[PDB]
Design an enzyme around this catalytic site. Structure first.
Site, PDB file in Angstrom:
ATOM      1  N   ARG A  36       0.814  -1.201   0.000  1.00  0.00           N
ATOM      2  CA  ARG A  36       0.000   0.000   0.000  1.00  0.00           C
ATOM      3  C   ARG A  36       0.855   1.261   0.000  1.00  0.00           C
ATOM      4  NH1 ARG A  36      -0.596  -3.812   1.940  1.00  0.00           N
ATOM      5  NH2 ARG A  36      -2.448  -5.152   1.936  1.00  0.00           N
ATOM      6  N   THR A  37       1.745   1.345   0.988  1.00  0.00           N
ATOM      7  CA  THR A  37       2.493   2.596   1.116  1.00  0.00           C
ATOM      8  C   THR A  37       3.315   2.875  -0.128  1.00  0.00           C
ATOM      9  OG1 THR A  37       2.613   2.077   3.473  1.00  0.00           O
ATOM     10  CG2 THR A  37       3.828   3.988   2.730  1.00  0.00           C
TER      11      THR A  37
ATOM     12  N   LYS B  96      24.207  -3.228   3.253  1.00  0.00           N
ATOM     13  CA  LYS B  96      25.556  -3.374   2.772  1.00  0.00           C
ATOM     14  C   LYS B  96      26.317  -2.112   2.877  1.00  0.00           C
ATOM     15  CE  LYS B  96      27.433  -7.024   0.326  1.00  0.00           C
ATOM     16  NZ  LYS B  96      27.110  -6.058  -0.736  1.00  0.00           N
TER      17      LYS B  96
ATOM     18  N   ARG C 219      10.870   4.210   3.528  1.00  0.00           N
ATOM     19  CA  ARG C 219      10.512   3.223   4.536  1.00  0.00           C
ATOM     20  C   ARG C 219      11.810   2.527   4.949  1.00  0.00           C
ATOM     21  NH1 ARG C 219       5.505  -0.910   4.576  1.00  0.00           N
ATOM     22  NH2 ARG C 219       4.707   0.565   6.167  1.00  0.00           N
TER      23      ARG C 219
ATOM     24  N   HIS D 189       4.570   6.238  11.549  1.00  0.00           N
ATOM     25  CA  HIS D 189       3.851   6.074  10.303  1.00  0.00           C
ATOM     26  C   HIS D 189       2.759   7.139  10.187  1.00  0.00           C
ATOM     27  CE1 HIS D 189       2.445   2.802   7.201  1.00  0.00           C
ATOM     28  NE2 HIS D 189       3.045   3.828   6.638  1.00  0.00           N
TER      29      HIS D 189
END
Ligand code: ZN
Ligand code: ZN
Lengths: 153, 310, 153, 310, 310, 310
Positions: free
Chosen positions: F54-55, F84, F105, F134
């Site tokens: 969704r996001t 990494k 995110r 959020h």
């Protein structure tokens, strides 16, 4: 051998007095060798007026005496330091740091695959001179390193 | 007791020439007259935190050939401990409460040496501790040099290939440096040359050696030809190819080699020894591998056995 | 001001004097806020005889003065500390530490998923008091801990 | 025969206090006078569908110490069966046609109990069946409590940490509930508190216990200090940190502990016991681990041996 | 018809000194006067068969900064074409029936040149072909170097780190050889130094180039500082920490440095560059990255458009 | 200068009650009168270092619904920057030389706030920073709540499920505390309840909030029903099926419910919500998702534009 006489000084009745520590090595020592992890009286002078250094480092520990090894332990850092034992307001004997044979607990291995890094162990290094630098060989990975390198920030 | 009773075999440097001779001697004897119920009732831990099923299988085979029981594992990402939680100390500590000796392979250098501090009395044998040491391989090696040459003294020993990243060659050289009159030939590519310190111990101990570019250059004088793998990964796959053609052994290359000349190789080979060499007498890498069994039998016997009665 | 026992000692020219540091905190502060990094004569009185306050530590940095805020930094280690501005051997004036708003780059976020760990970021907590407990909140992960939990380091 | 001959050891609840004493007794004897050719010719299956190389190694070590032969595996995503095709029944069914007993670890609860329905006559020992049972661990545990305390009766036993998700503590408590006069201390964080049912069996059987927040609170009365791991994963990595400082044991914390006080821990520890505790006499987790060997030797002997002749 | 309309960009050696100056001029025009509807209705394929961060994002951004449309992929680990069975040829042969230009990164040497042969009319741009070429990096190196000094000529340019393996470092060298009066300080470990071929062309070119042990050895003599990242896995963890100390940059090394002097790095940087350099004027690596936008815009611009009105 | 032009959106607590109402107003304006050339020539980076459905899709769609251009990545599992070796800092430090705004995110708590420090002028928007914040979810929660009831004030709002771990559930709580006359029903398992800090602010705020055992216990008293998904892996499979029964919603629980009442869920839903609820008027979770478009459009709008003419 340091005489400040406008804001005078005191030389403890008994205990050890470490002289001529180069400056900024002073903290390095007692942080490295937990000399402050004692409840006895400690007197520390930082960036003092020295004749040879101008800015010197001077620890004074009371009712406390250090093995020669202890003193030898300091050779790496303060190779010109001066340990003075003291009893009854008097100089019961000078001492001098001599390059040890081995260097446990304080050192850290340059080898990032040495097992001393992930496990609970005491770093040990064998000390050998090489007419340019002292070489330190790790107890575990058996890798040898320049003291210049082992002492790297 | 024997000099090695109940001692930890961690590095090849901790061993004396006597200690070496003693093991080599024993090896010859167990190779000669097998004592298959010698380590009966003994239980040995075969802990390979690092997979290596050539070393492992050897050791374990050894273990059974002396009548010991075997428990252990291979790669401990399968094992339950050591991925984030269990320390190696806590692991050795538990293990050494119920086996008679520990054989361990480990990815980090100094892992075998650390074991000793927690195993208490249970002996620890290094089967590889990262790039550090692999004593048994060297033992295997010497015992094959000796058994084929007849000595460890006054040899003409050539090491070839990746001399820079070959722990087994550095050990061999050190070990061989324990004996006298030895002469060394270092035939390696410049990016992979014999490390300075090793070179200094030679200069220091008075041992003669010289660098060479061509095997051919020095074939006719070598008794032992020790080959190493030139792990391409160690360099440019194009810069590899450019050199590789100089440090690869074909059957034909040996035509002027002494009768007693033996070609050695720790294994696994891959490109450096042509298969046509196998077909020749000089080829001794498989034999050298099998000799790994007595080298290890030798070791196990002496550490675990107060009196070696042979 | 001055320490002695029948014999003199020092009162530095100008500079601050931290005093009544509790036992075995003076070092922390020295290492913590890194007050040893100057090149001016520092004086440190370890495990001195407080008698009345027990046996507190003491620091005397000369030619160096303390901001209203760094004084509050010590609010969490030496709340009873007493910092005296000193000129011409005497006390121009002194404060006590009062509680700061935020404690910066000395503390460490107990939250192990806080981004703050890996990165080249200097920590900062927001100091709040409730009952007798103090609560620092992570500027990043925004997690609130008791001052006892973040005070491991 | 012995009460346990040819029986399946599946849950700690199926065992009587006599059954317990019998095993504990035997354990002491095999610890005392070893019978190394006792289970000779017997072949045992060490099936660890779930990796756990602490339990495994123990068991297997046990197995060899009685002279049994060992076959098995570890993680059956490597094994050929059980990823989509072979049932566990069909697997036990085949296995139990050619070994003398089965030791099995399994991810699903009730896996050991199911085995019994297909093994026919071959005995099945549970080495862990998901969160359900792990009898041998408890046996190991008791036998260490007994051997150090001198009894299983009238003890002051404290369990600490993740009391909610610790199968071994629930078993211990149950087991210990088989004996009388025992007193319990539950020092756990509220999200991880001793489950109700356990608490009811105590209240029900008349056993005394109380919750506590501080070890210090109750140190001076405990004979046994049973520690558990507080798997952070079990909660918020921030909410973990907040509590963790209350259920971590430092050397210093023990200064008022009885002479006979023993610190226990199933392993692997990690953060809850400071290494400075190792250096003390109260530390008995390694010893407790090694006692795992007799607990298991004990078991193996009795199930497989009609007459235990000691 | 601009000199690069419809032309392919595989290797830096394919570009004249004029072609260079051409691109950079454009690049600085575009930096000034954005033309974000310039490549409208063109559709560009961004085919990263190897990972990229800067190159893939900077390129696609460049693509949108001029109105173009992007399609493509990243991490073609194996999927459907290329590594998994379809030949790159065939891949291209179909992707060129789709878009107007192709951008590609590929782990094999010369993949981009191969593409050339199957794209028919559609131009390919080299985003990294194995250890071979990386023009658009080097283009954004040159622009930045000129943006900050005013010339690509008669410079004191020092390169550090992995001068043996670092493509960008050789590329950069090659291009600056096309301008005159430029002199090089190669400051790398001997196990990691500038290949001789480079060294030869400089000498077959007449260019002056020294070889310095350390960075603060040449510090005061340089206009541009070029830090290539040193790979530890290509080195012993012992060895990697042996020379390491004198190939890391820290703000304290910077005092003797001229003010004209800028530190650039192709990125990512690990620890070769200390974070205190981050807050220093010579620090110009993040900026250098920003300029990758304009360098890449210009190129796209130039290859796809007849000529501009800028 | 709109109150949020050029502002960062990290945590909900950073937003005033006005800032909220501001966004939502916009959001409803935009829902009415689309402006799909509003963010033309802006280029937005969508940097998902953690998975999102969704996001990530709603955001990018929002991005195109206003003419913006998107670049970015998803599943930066390790690749080149972030996990990494490159630091997030450095990552951002270069991505902000590329785009006009950043959306990200990230699995670590506070990654988005950190970003703030290295994006320089470029705004970052928080799309989920670990278990922390959020905002844009919560913004699309509020809009929907208001779209369906007409007020954000004086409401009967019931939250269910994982009130202990569910960020969106605390966030939602925090924001609704900014409006008055709102009262909460917290219907969760005790092993999964609303943290006390929340409970405290509500009380330091004067807000009324009860605690209900089950959903159909409060049913008739509520306007909004907020189902947070319960995590089984965070629970025993036995335990997870212990309370489970009274925290699942089914159409039969809905009869006593008011008609004003709507069921929303942040999604994805597993089985907490039965499919027969799917065909019921109170069912408003899919709609809630649709509105994520407008909530996210508004925000992008507001942050990047001086102010609108809507
Ligand atoms: Zn080491
Ligand atoms: Zn934090």
């Amino acid at each position: 051998m340091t005489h400040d006489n406008k804001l005078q000084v005191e030389a403890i009745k008994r205990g050890t007095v470490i002289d001529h520590i180069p400056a900024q090595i002073g903290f390095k020592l007692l942080s490295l060798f937990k000399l402050t992890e004692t409840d006895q009286r400690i007197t520390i002078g930082l960036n003092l007026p020295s004749g040879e250094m101008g800015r010197k480092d001077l620890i004074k520990i009371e009712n406390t005496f250090l093995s020669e090894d202890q003193v030898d332990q300091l050779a790496l850092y303060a190779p010109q330091a001066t340990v003075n034992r003291i009893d009854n307001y008097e100089v019961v004997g000078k001492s001098r740091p001599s390059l040890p044979e081995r260097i446990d607990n304080v050192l850290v291995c340059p080898n990032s695959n040495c097992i001393s890094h992930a496990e609970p162990v005491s770093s040990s290094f064998a000390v050998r001179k090489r007419a340019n630098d002292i070489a330190l060989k790790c107890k575990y990975c058996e890798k040898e390193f320049s003291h210049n390198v082992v002492l790297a920030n | 007791a024997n000099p090695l009773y109940q001692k930890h075999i961690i590095s090849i440097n901790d061993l004396s020439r006597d200690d070496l001779n003693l093991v080599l001697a024993t090896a010859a004897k167990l190779k000669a007259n097998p004592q298959p119920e010698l380590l009966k009732h003994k239980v040995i831990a075969s802990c390979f935190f690092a997979a290596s099923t050539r070393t492992r299988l050897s050791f374990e085979t050894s273990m059974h050939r002396l009548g010991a029981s075997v428990v252990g594992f291979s790669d401990s990402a399968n094992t339950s401990l050591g991925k984030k939680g269990e320390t190696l100390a806590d692991t050795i500590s538990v293990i050494s409460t119920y086996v008679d000796a520990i054989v361990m392979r480990h990815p980090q250098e100094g892992a075998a040496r650390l074991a000793t501090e927690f195993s208490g009395n249970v002996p620890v044998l290094n089967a590889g501790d990262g790039s550090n040491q692999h004593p048994t391989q060297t033992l295997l090696d010497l015992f094959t040099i000796q058994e084929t040459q007849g000595r460890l003294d006054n040899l003409h020993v050539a090491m070839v290939g990746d001399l820079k990243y070959g722990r087994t060659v550095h050990s061999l050289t050190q070990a061989l440096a324990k004996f006298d009159g030895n002469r060394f030939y270092f035939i390696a590519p410049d990016a992979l040359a014999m490390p300075q310190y090793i070179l200094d111990m030679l200069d220091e101990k008075g041992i003669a050696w010289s660098l060479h570019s061509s095997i051919e250059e020095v074939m006719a004088e070598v008794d032992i030809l020790y080959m190493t793998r030139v792990q391409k990964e160690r360099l440019d796959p194009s810069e590899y190819a450019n050199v590789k053609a100089q440090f690869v052994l074909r059957a034909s290359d040996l035509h002027n080699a002494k009768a007693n000349m033996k070609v050695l190789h720790p294994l696994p080979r891959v490109d450096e020894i042509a298969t046509d060499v196998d077909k020749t007498p000089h080829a001794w890498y498989f034999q050298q591998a099998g000799n790994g069994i007595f080298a290890r039998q030798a070791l196990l016997a002496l550490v675990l056995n107060r009196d070696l009665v042979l």
